[model samples]
Target: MPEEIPDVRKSVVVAASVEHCFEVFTSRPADWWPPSHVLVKKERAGLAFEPFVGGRYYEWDIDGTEIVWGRILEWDPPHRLAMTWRIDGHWQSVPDDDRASEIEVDFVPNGSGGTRVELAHVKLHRHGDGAWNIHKALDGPSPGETLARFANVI
Candidate 1:
């Protein structure tokens, strides 16, 4: 068997209402996400996370094309959601750039209607450069920073 590869984990906390933060992260990826970044491309990408287990994590292009980028591994709306991050935009098979990982978003409610929103992105592997790429794609502009700015709107 091949050697077990290393997986990097990243976490960020946001101050906002749990439900509000959840919606912003899921339904409004286009708003705060950097345009030049991976998931939200300059003109050709929009991120989406369906609000339930077995739901889809998808991306859309300007040409009206859809890609099942990943699947919801766990779902508990307004609270937590986990997704299998399979790289290369292929949801069915392991692509030539296959690398599987997971992303978990947890919404911990705090006082004053505030929420301790934690985003845990993990499971990157050594030979899984695609996994790293996928993470980097969404890493730009910092989701935490974007979400903080959206707090007022929520």
Candidate 2:
């Protein structure tokens, strides 16, 4: 057993439609995520999140060595999305969501046709002992660096 780990929440607004914002985050995530986040020690290809519940959200190497990051937990087009984070406390990829946290992303209209995107990493206590390190890395006020980069792309 381990101590509780807090959720990491971030938000940002972009001058784009909600559907467009959701599309980039859920479909073309490879464009924004940094190369240093790779779990494999090989040439990276791209990251993909299959756009439905129970879909495989994973990354692959140039040689087709696919590492499953997690599965889709919730899928609501252009509005809300949730997925499992199947990385363990050591930042190592795990086999299933039993020991993983959950990430939920929300997109809403900002009253002027733009989109407000919110991201939250919940259930982090499931990561067990080394969870605090993950919290330290993700802790921030709002409009996190990752979401800011994503907004720039939108």
The best candidate in terms of lDDT = 2
What is the TM-score (0 to 1) of candidate 1? 0.61
lDDT of 2 at 103: 78
Tens digits of lDDT, candidate 2, 10-128? 67777878777656656766555465553223454777666667666666557656566555677776677676665545444655546765678777777656888787877676665
Off by over 4 Å in 1: 1-6, 9-12, 33-41, 44-49, 77-79, 89-98, 139-154
Highest-scoring model, TM-score: 2
TM-score list, all predictions: 0.61, 0.64
